[PDB]
Amino acid sequence: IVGGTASVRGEWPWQVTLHTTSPTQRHLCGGSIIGNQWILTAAHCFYGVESPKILRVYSGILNQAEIAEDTSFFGVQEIIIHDQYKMAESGYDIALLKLETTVNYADSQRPISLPSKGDRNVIYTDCWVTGWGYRKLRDKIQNTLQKAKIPLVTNEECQKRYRGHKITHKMICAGYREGGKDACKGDSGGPLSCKHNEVWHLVGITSWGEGCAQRERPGVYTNVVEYVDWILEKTQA
Ligand SMILES: *[C@](=O)([C]([C][C][C][N]C([N])=[N])[N]C(=O)[C]N1C(=O)C([N])=[C]N=C1C1=[C][C]=[C]C([C])=[C]1)C1=N[C]=[C]S1
């Protein structure tokens, strides 16, 4: 996260850090708890991943330092990538992780509500992007979960900032015309929490962007609401 600040412990209980154990354990991507056994994240986060066996999901984490060999974690039983996904920049950057065991909800870990179709007209004025990603280009995973408030921008406005790309309605962007605050390498799969009516909503999933926090280069996110039907279909046994 660029231009952000340290999060308060438990402030974003749906945020999880997804690790890979190969070759050695390290943070790979962010993710959001949306069910007792489901993590919603980015599909482009599994590039080079042949098996869910090397994945580990940690919930209720603030500092990566809390993660040691003796720290409990959730195994991943199955990785579900949207069948239309090809690459982050083309859209459909959405994936579901089915955990091997269920998450016991607590103040440190609980699920975030998915947006409803009857909310595409809602004016989210209080949105935040969170993660352990870079604070800039060519950096490294940060220890303390970072947070940054960032305004959503219209699709028409985002398209202007990304000529050469096709910003569809299944994407949503956010950022400052002047840059300064934004997601970065490592925040991928992270949630884009929007506070609307004393209630948090998973509006987007950190997907891509040109560089990090550059001026006139909004972060691009998966427009979650466009996938509630997909999410329902894939999570029902
Ligand atoms: C991510 O967290 C990053 C976050 C980048 C978001 N940046 C801004 N300014 N909002 N995601 C990517 O690197 C995804 N990505 C791109 O954004 C671009 N421009 C080109 N390629 C990719 C990409 C696609 C598939 C696989 C990879 C490794 C990169 C991370 N996601 C994985 C590691 S860090």
Ligand 1 pocket test, candidate residues 188, 210, 222, most atoms within 8 A of CB: 188
Q: Binding site annotation covers 26?
A: no
The CB density around residue 200, as the number of other CB atoms within 10 Å, is 18
Q: Binding site annotation covers 163?
A: yes
Q: Are 1-12+112-226 and 13-111+227-237 the same fold in CATH?
A: yes
| CATH number for the domain whose boundaries are 13-111+227-237 | 2.40.10.10
Q: Which fold has domain 1-12+112-226?
A: Thrombin, subunit H (2.40.10)
Query: Of the listed 93, 182, 187, 193, which one is catalytic?
Result: 93
Quick one: which of 203, 43, 174 has its CA closest to 112? Answer: 203
Identify the residue whose C-alpha is closest to ligand 1 atom 32: 45
Domain boundaries, the chain: 1-12+112-226, 13-111+227-237
Ligand 1: centre distance to CA 186 (Å): 8
Long-range contacts made by residues 90-93, C-beta under 8 angstroms, separation at least 24? 90/166, 91/168, 91/170, 91/171, 91/222, 92/43, 92/170, 92/222, 93/42, 93/43, 93/44, 93/205, 93/207, 93/208, 93/222
Q: What is the largest CA-CA distance in the chain?
A: 49
> Mind giving me the DSSP string for 149-178?
E--EE-HHHHHHH-TTS---TTEEEE--TT
In what helix (H) or strand (E) does residue 20 lie, and over which residues does it extend?
strand 15-20
Residues 99 and 135: their CA atoms lie apart, in Å, by 29
CA 205 vs CA 70, 88, 104: distances in Å: 30, 11, 23
The CB density around residue 78, as the number of other CB atoms within 10 Å, is 11
Ligand 1: centre distance to CA 156 (Å): 22
- Does residue 82 have an active-site annotation? no
- Does residue 113 have an active-site annotation? no
Residue 30 pairs in a beta bridge with: 17
Pocket of ligand 1 (CB under 6 A): 29, 44-45, 47, 87-88, 133, 182-188, 206, 208-209, 211-212, 219
Residue 15 pairs in a beta bridge with: 32
Query: What determination technique applies here?
Result: X-ray
Resolution value (Å, 1 decimal): 2.5
